[PDB]
Design an enzyme around this catalytic site. Structure first.
Site, PDB file in Angstrom:
ATOM      1  CG  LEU A  18      -2.231   0.762   1.218  1.00 24.41           C
ATOM      2  CD1 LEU A  18      -3.124   0.328  -0.255  1.00 24.41           C
ATOM      3  CD2 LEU A  18      -3.189   0.844   2.274  1.00 24.41           C
ATOM      4  N   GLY A  19       1.966   1.202   0.683  1.00 26.04           N
ATOM      5  CA  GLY A  19       2.853   2.425   0.677  1.00 26.04           C
ATOM      6  C   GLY A  19       4.134   2.059   1.512  1.00 26.04           C
ATOM      7  CB  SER A  20       7.336   1.255   1.178  1.00 32.22           C
ATOM      8  OG  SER A  20       7.015   1.131  -0.040  1.00 32.22           O
ATOM      9  CG  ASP A 125       2.085  16.480   9.688  1.00 33.82           C
ATOM     10  OD1 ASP A 125       2.188  17.718   8.855  1.00 33.82           O
ATOM     11  OD2 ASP A 125       2.565  15.522   9.581  1.00 33.82           O
TER      12      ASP A 125
HETATM   13  C1  LIG Z   1      -1.654   9.773  -0.185  1.00 32.91           C
HETATM   14  C2  LIG Z   1      -1.583   8.297   0.226  1.00 32.91           C
HETATM   15  C3  LIG Z   1      -2.404   7.200   0.607  1.00 32.91           C
HETATM   16  O1  LIG Z   1      -3.048   7.462   1.555  1.00 32.91           O
HETATM   17  N1  LIG Z   1      -2.589   5.895  -0.307  1.00 32.91           N
HETATM   18  C4  LIG Z   1      -3.694   5.043   0.016  1.00 32.91           C
HETATM   19  C5  LIG Z   1      -4.316   4.681   1.500  1.00 32.91           C
HETATM   20  C6  LIG Z   1      -5.296   3.766   1.509  1.00 32.91           C
HETATM   21  N2  LIG Z   1      -5.824   3.362   2.959  1.00 32.91           N
HETATM   22  C7  LIG Z   1      -5.409   3.477   4.183  1.00 32.91           C
HETATM   23  N3  LIG Z   1      -6.044   3.495   5.281  1.00 32.91           N
HETATM   24  C8  LIG Z   1      -5.699   3.562   6.373  1.00 32.91           C
HETATM   25  C9  LIG Z   1      -4.232   3.988   6.594  1.00 32.91           C
HETATM   26  C10 LIG Z   1      -3.541   4.307   5.442  1.00 32.91           C
HETATM   27  C11 LIG Z   1      -1.956   5.028   5.475  1.00 32.91           C
HETATM   28  C12 LIG Z   1      -1.600   5.400   6.743  1.00 32.91           C
HETATM   29  N4  LIG Z   1      -0.426   5.568   6.547  1.00 32.91           N
HETATM   30  C13 LIG Z   1       0.640   6.368   7.430  1.00 32.91           C
HETATM   31  C14 LIG Z   1       1.419   7.792   7.586  1.00 32.91           C
HETATM   32  C15 LIG Z   1       0.233   7.077   8.521  1.00 32.91           C
HETATM   33  C16 LIG Z   1      -0.049   5.482   4.978  1.00 32.91           C
HETATM   34  C17 LIG Z   1       0.905   5.859   4.303  1.00 32.91           C
HETATM   35  C18 LIG Z   1       1.224   5.242   3.039  1.00 32.91           C
HETATM   36  C19 LIG Z   1       0.013   4.741   2.157  1.00 32.91           C
HETATM   37  C20 LIG Z   1      -1.144   4.469   3.220  1.00 32.91           C
HETATM   38  C21 LIG Z   1      -1.082   4.961   4.405  1.00 32.91           C
HETATM   39  N5  LIG Z   1      -4.046   4.050   4.259  1.00 32.91           N
HETATM   40  C22 LIG Z   1      -5.726   3.112   0.230  1.00 32.91           C
HETATM   41  O2  LIG Z   1      -6.746   2.173   0.697  1.00 32.91           O
HETATM   42  C23 LIG Z   1      -6.643   1.151  -0.607  1.00 32.91           C
HETATM   43  C24 LIG Z   1      -5.252   3.372  -0.964  1.00 32.91           C
HETATM   44  C25 LIG Z   1      -4.259   4.340  -0.982  1.00 32.91           C
HETATM   45  N6  LIG Z   1      -3.674   4.510  -2.315  1.00 32.91           N
HETATM   46  C26 LIG Z   1      -4.384   5.520  -3.230  1.00 32.91           C
HETATM   47  C27 LIG Z   1      -2.538   3.831  -2.696  1.00 32.91           C
HETATM   48  C28 LIG Z   1      -1.756   4.758  -3.912  1.00 32.91           C
HETATM   49  N7  LIG Z   1      -0.758   5.852  -3.144  1.00 32.91           N
HETATM   50  C29 LIG Z   1      -0.156   6.400  -4.046  1.00 32.91           C
HETATM   51  C30 LIG Z   1      -0.127   5.282  -2.208  1.00 32.91           C
END
Ligand SMILES: *CCC(=O)Nc1cc(Nc2nccc(-c3cn(C4CC4)c4ccccc34)n2)c(OC)cc1N(C)CCN(C)C
Length: 266
Positions: A18-20, A125
């Protein structure tokens, strides 16, 4: 007042990434919960400070903490927000965001911040990247890693004197609304962060977004006053945007205008 919030510790054998790293998974304690799992001593000490904050808040517009897993890596487990951060969402859907959604998002973010102020909590933030989207009709505030630095969202008092208040969050709220109304533009795009402190002192602000009436841009300007106590309160921002949500085209001119969610597992 004692903080009687409960810290839930979850078995690792209950999750199925999902994200790194942040991952998408299910939590199965007959119930399956769509969740987001987030995997040196510095890293562990800070991610537990974040779990402390999220476990101590409970509001429909604040991201809920489901539990932590104490494995080799400390894993935080939160509610899965399937539509992402609001910043990516407004960029990927500019051609389809109506004034109703924009004004309602501003109401919900202000409600979440007003609750955080009741909890005597400063986010430090607030930004469009730190607002997740459960559904297009329901957003929540997230990322409490600094909640008790991104210069382009901070009040002038936070830049100069490292002072942070609920009213400095109001400044960040002003920038967040500006990101939304510009459909995801970068604040002070191009301007190096070291120059932001001089620009704000000279009296310059972020420009008026094209879709914004003077009513909406006036509210942003009020969030950016030098005098923190002259900036509006979150309870007032709720009232203002809620009135505008009852006639959105009057304030935003836009062309062409067993799985159970965590909110039901109490
Ligand atoms: C802008 C980035 C993003 O939010 N991408 C994303 C999120 C979710 N669901 C989700 N649910 C709960 C928590 C999180 C999340 C929390 N963090 C950290 C900093 C506190 C992150 C960091 C990076 C990614 C996500 C989280 N996320 C999605 O549910 C499916 C889908 C996405 N995307 C749109 C993926 C594509 N992005 C470019 C990563």
């Amino acid at each position: 007042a004692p903080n009687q919030a409960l810290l839930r510790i979850l078995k690792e054998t209950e999750f199925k990434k999902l994200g790194s790293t942040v991952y998408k998974g299910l939590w199965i304690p007959k119930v399956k919960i769509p969740v987001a799992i987030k995997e040196s001593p510095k890293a562990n000490k800070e991610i537990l400070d974040e779990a402390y904050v999220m476990a101590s808040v409970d509001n429909p517009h604040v991201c809920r903490l489901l539990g932590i897993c104490l494995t080799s890596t400390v894993q935080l487990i939160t509610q899965l927000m399937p539509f992402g951060c609001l910043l990516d969402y407004v960029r990927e859907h500019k051609d389809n965001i109506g004034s109703q959604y924009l004004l309602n998002w501003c109401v919900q973010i202000a409600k979440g911040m007003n609750y955080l102020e009741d909890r005597r909590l400063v986010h430090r933030d607030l930004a469009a990247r730190n607002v997740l989207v459960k559904t297009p009709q329901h957003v929540k505030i997230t990322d409490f890693g600094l909640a008790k630095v991104p210069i382009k969202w901070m009040a002038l008092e936070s830049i100069l004197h490292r002072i942070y208040t609920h009213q400095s969050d109001v400044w960040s709220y002003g920038v967040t609304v500006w990101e939304l109304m510009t459909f995801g533009s970068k604040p002070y795009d191009g301007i190096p962060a070291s120059e932001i402190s001089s620009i704000l002192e000279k009296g310059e602000r972020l420009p008026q977004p094209p879709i914004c009436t003077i009513d909406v841009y006036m509210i942003m300007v009020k969030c950016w006053m030098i005098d923190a106590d002259s900036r509006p309160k979150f309870r007032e921002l709720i009232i203002e945007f809620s009135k505008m949500a009852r006639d959105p085209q009057r304030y935003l001119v836009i062309q062409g205008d067993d799985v159970v969610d965590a909110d039901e597992y109490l």
